Amino acid sequence: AYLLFYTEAKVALAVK
Amino acid sequence: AYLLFYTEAKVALAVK
Amino acid sequence: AYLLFYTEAKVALAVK
Amino acid sequence: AYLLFYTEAKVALAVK
Amino acid sequence: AYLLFYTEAKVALAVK
Amino acid sequence: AYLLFYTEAKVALAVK
Amino acid sequence: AYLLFYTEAKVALAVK
Amino acid sequence: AYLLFYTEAKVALAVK
Amino acid sequence: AYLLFYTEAKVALAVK
Amino acid sequence: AYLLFYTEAKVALAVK
Amino acid sequence: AYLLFYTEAKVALAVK
Amino acid sequence: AYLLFYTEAKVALAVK
Numbered sequence: 001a002y003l004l005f006y007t008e009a010k011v012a013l014a015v016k
Numbered sequence: 017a018y019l020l021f022y023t024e025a026k027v028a029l030a031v032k
Numbered sequence: 033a034y035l036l037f038y039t040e041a042k043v044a045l046a047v048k
Numbered sequence: 049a050y051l052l053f054y055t056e057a058k059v060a061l062a063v064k
Numbered sequence: 065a066y067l068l069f070y071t072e073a074k075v076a077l078a079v080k
Numbered sequence: 081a082y083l084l085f086y087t088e089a090k091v092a093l094a095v096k
Numbered sequence: 097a098y099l100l101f102y103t104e105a106k107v108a109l110a111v112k
Numbered sequence: 113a114y115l116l117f118y119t120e121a122k123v124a125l126a127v128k
Numbered sequence: 129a130y131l132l133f134y135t136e137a138k139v140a141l142a143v144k
Numbered sequence: 145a146y147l148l149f150y151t152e153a154k155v156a157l158a159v160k
Numbered sequence: 161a162y163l164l165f166y167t168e169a170k171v172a173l174a175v176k
Numbered sequence: 177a178y179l180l181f182y183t184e185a186k187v188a189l190a191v192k
């Protein structure tokens with residue numbers, strides 16, 4: 001699965 | 017901060 | 033699961 | 049052998 | 065920010 | 081030189 | 097600087 | 113392709 | 129197998 | 145302590 | 161394949 | 177310091 005890095009600012013992650 | 021791994025049933029991440 | 037770097041460009045971390 | 053990051057959560061460096 | 069492996073034991077991924 | 085993963089979003093390998 | 101991945105077929109690296 | 117640290121001695125980055 | 133670290137000083141490397 | 149990849153060529157894993 | 165780090169001044173990369 | 181890999185048949189480590 002993908003580890004997506006995004007900004008909610010500061011860094012946050014999601015897994016897909 | 018550091019990345020936390022926990023179980024969402026996949027692995028899931030959080031930044032602490 | 034394994035945390036494996038990969039490329040397609042970008043490098044990214046996969047959860048396998 | 050491969051040096052792979054691994055998690056069941058903690059991460060460990062696995063020597064396969 | 066840097067993604068830095070560290071130990072204090074297992075390893076963890078610091079976001080710096 | 082150090083090889084440091086980083087992210088600002090993409091991840092990349094910095095050479096320091 | 098950072099490591100670039102690009103396709104020249106096969107993936108190749110450059111330091112930028 | 114995967115980027116896998118590897119060692120038989122030196123560590124090396126394999127591209128699979 | 130995987131590596132665990134044990135530290136006090138200087139870092140020590142137990143294998144499992 | 146940080147676990148940082150580096151290269152002077154070979155890659156190696158530093159303990160900082 | 162292997163990522164190679166070679167010197168030519170500065171450090172350059174090759175995949176073989 | 178840096179992690180040293182050697183052969184004991186398996187891969188073993190030491191901190192130097």
Ligand SMILES: [Cl-]
Nearest residue numbers: 136137138139
């Ligand atoms: Cl001290």
Ligand SMILES: [Cl-]
Nearest residue numbers: 183184185186
């Ligand atoms: Cl031997």
